[PDB]
Amino acid sequence: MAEPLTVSPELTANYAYFFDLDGTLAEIKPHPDQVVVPHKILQLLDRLAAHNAGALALISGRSMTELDALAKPFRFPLAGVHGAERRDINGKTHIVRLPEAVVREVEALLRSTLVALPGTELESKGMAFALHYRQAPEHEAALLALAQHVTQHWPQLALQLGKCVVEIKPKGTNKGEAIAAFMQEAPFAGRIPVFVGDDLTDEAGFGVVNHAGGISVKVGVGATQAAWRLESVPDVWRWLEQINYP
Ligand SMILES: OC[C@H]1O[C@H](O[C@H]2O[C@H](CO)[C@@H](O)[C@H](O)[C@H]2O)[C@H](O)[C@@H](O)[C@@H]1O
Ligand SMILES: [Cl-]
Ligand SMILES: [Mg+2]
């Protein structure tokens, strides 16, 4: 249904760019700390943002600190934890805050329930919890069910499944509303949104980008509502390089 992306926009057009990180700008790794965005890709992203009035943001499930570590030394506008954290063009940060008791109780519950599922990792993000199972995919069901119970008992929380992960996020947080928040602010406002992603959390973004008359690009295999598809992360790199130097 999605058609292959074989054209690259002009460098100085009227576009606003949104990129996912893991699986879109950097190749998937067995461990999150092994992920690297090549320095030339970061330079190309900086040049694209510069020629489009700075209207380029990184929309990711990572925390903003890890996004800063990955994009160092560059400091882009950011949306982390699927939108629960954001940083606009002026550097102002917006953080969704959960009650302290909810965070404490949910963290304790997950830590205790994790013992009977070896190889799974619990990553606490302040206002979210990621359950990784790449080292032991057989627990994928269990974690899922477990998360489904948490969201049942704490209505403040919603589910976000993803590649080798089950995340529990604040309800109402999604990449679509993060892109929406960016698109009503300068310098993104007035430009055509472009969003490149690869996972389920990105579909929301795709939706809001399609309704706005923008360009949605899916990376990798799988069904999608994005209008365009790129085969792999190196193809995203080639696409970016073609934008910068046709
Ligand atoms: O590619 C390396 C890792 O990417 C994923 O993990 C990242 O993306 C998740 C998005 O939901 C975040 O929750 C997580 O904090 C990031 O580390 C993937 O889940 C991992 O298995 C990969 O090792
Ligand atoms: Cl993500
Ligand atoms: Mg991704």
Q: Residue 116: which domain range?
A: 96-172
For the chain, the domain total comes to 2
| Shared domain check, 168 and 104 | yes
d(CA 206, CA 202): 6
| Shared domain check, 140 and 30 | no
User: Residues 179, 208: contact at Cβ < 8 Å?
Assistant: yes
Q: Is 137 in the pocket of ligand 1 (CB under 6 A)?
A: no
| Shared domain check, 202 and 81 | yes
Residue 30 Cα distances to 35, 96, 167, angstroms: 9, 29, 17
| Shared domain check, 224 and 152 | no
d(CA 127, CA 119): 23
Active site residue 20: yes
Q: Which of 157, 172, 187 is the last residue before a domain boundary?
A: 172
Residue nearest to atom 1 of ligand 1 (CA): 28
Q: Which of 172, 197, 225 is the last residue before a domain boundary?
A: 172
Here the tokens at position 91 are 């550097």
d(CA 206, CA 193): 10
* Residue 198 among known ligand-binding residues: yes
77-79-85 Cα angle (round to 5): 120
Q: Is 167 in the pocket of ligand 1 (CB under 6 A)?
A: yes
Q: Which of 172, 205, 235 is the last residue before a domain boundary?
A: 172
- Exposure string over 35-73, b if 16+ CB within 10 A, otherwise e: bebeeebbebbbbbbebbbbbbbbbbbbbbebbbebbee
| Shared domain check, 228 and 196 | yes
Q: By what technique were these coordinates determined?
A: X-ray
| Shared domain check, 185 and 165 | no
| Shared domain check, 240 and 195 | yes
User: Residues 157, 151: contact at Cβ < 8 Å?
Assistant: yes
d(CA 124, CA 103): 9
Residue 6 Cα distances to 152, 215, 238, 241, 245, angstroms: 44, 13, 10, 13, 15
| Shared domain check, 101 and 79 | no
| Shared domain check, 80 and 190 | yes
CA 201 to ligand 2 centroid distance, Å: 6
Q: Is 122 in the pocket of ligand 1 (CB under 6 A)?
A: no
Residue nearest to atom 17 of ligand 1 (CA): 32
| Shared domain check, 109 and 210 | no
| Shared domain check, 202 and 140 | no
Largest Cα separation within the chain, whole Å, is 54
Mapping DSSP to helix (H, G, I), strand (E, B) and coil, where does residue 48 land? helix
Deposited resolution, Å: 2.1
Q: Is 175 in the pocket of ligand 1 (CB under 6 A)?
A: no
Question: Element (H or E) spanning 230, and its range?
Answer: strand 228-230
d(CA 78, CA 69): 12
